[PDB]
Structure formats: C-alpha cells, structure tokens
Amino acid sequence: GIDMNTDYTLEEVGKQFDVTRERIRQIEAKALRKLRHPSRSEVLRSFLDD
Amino acid sequence: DPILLRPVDDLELTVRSANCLKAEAIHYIGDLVQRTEVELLKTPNLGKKSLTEIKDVLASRGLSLGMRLENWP
User: Fold this and answer.
1) Residue ranges of domains in chain B, CATH in brackets
2) Which long-range contacts (CB under 8 A, 24 or more apart) does B30-38 make?
3) Cβ of B7 under 8 Å from any chain A Cβ?
4) CB-based burial label for B34 (10 Å; 0-12, 13-18, 19+)
5) Closest B-chain CA to A35
6) Residue A13, min C-alpha distance to chain B (Å)
C-alpha cells in the first residue's frame, strides 16, 4: 500500500501485468533478495531503535 | 581497514561470479584483490563482463587492482 489509496492483491496485480502469479512471486522474491544484499539500505537497517 | 575485512558478498556480483569465487575459495575482498587480470581471465566461465563489473564496483568503493597486502592473516 505505497503511494496509493489501497493495496492490490497478488492475483489482481498479476492480471493487470499479464504475468502469472508464480512468476510475480518469483520476481518479488528476487527483489527481496536484492534488497537483502548488503552495501544497500544502510539507513533502512539504521531505522531500528533496538 | 574497515573495507578490507568485509565479506566477499558485498561485491554485488552475479551468480556466475559468486560460484567462480566460491570455487576460488576466497571469502574476503582484501584477499581477493591480490589476484591479477590474466589470472582472473584464465579462470573458466569468467568473461570480460565480470571483470568490468568488479573493476567498476572497486573504483566506486575506492579500491583498485595490482596492490599487495602485507602481514595479512
């Protein structure tokens, strides 16, 4: 739910993008892995107050 | 040196480069920068794209090749 009124489910997103649900899942997992890769999001890691 | 002892996974490379480094058995960037261009090129399944990417990332992160490490465990 980023920069929009509401979020969209994975199936509606796949339908809008003409991409299967599993391919959408794999692309999301690749994006999450790339964000978990180091040398990035250092301020995001610093955003924890514990 | 804070960036000499960092893990090799910070090199933002591809899976091909990652498995090449795993085969080379070098988990540290400080130990990895001791190799040379001909040695890197002669390794199988390692083209010019990986060399260009690693050179670009080293230049971006204030590192280069051809330097030697002294008293490095």
Assistant:
1) 1-73 (1.10.150.20)
2) B30/B1, B30/B4, B30/B5, B30/B69, B30/B72, B31/B69, B31/B72, B32/B8, B33/B58, B33/B63, B33/B64, B33/B65, B33/B67, B33/B69, B34/B67, B34/B68, B34/B69, B35/B65, B36/B65, B36/B66, B37/B65
3) yes
4) middle
5) B12
6) 28
- Give the DSSP per-residue string, B2-22: TTTSSBGGGG---HHHHHHHH
Helix (H/G/I), strand (E/B), else coil: B29: helix
Please spell the DSSP secondary structure of A2-39, one letter per residue.
Answer: -SSSS---HHHHHHHHT--HHHHHHHHHHHHHHHHSSS
Residues counted in chain B: 73
Give me A24's structure tokens. Answer: 């959408």
CA quadruple B73, B53, B35, A33: dihedral sign: positive
Alpha-carbon distance A25 to A29, whole Å? 6
Measure the CA–CA gap between B5 and B27, rounded to whole angstroms.
10
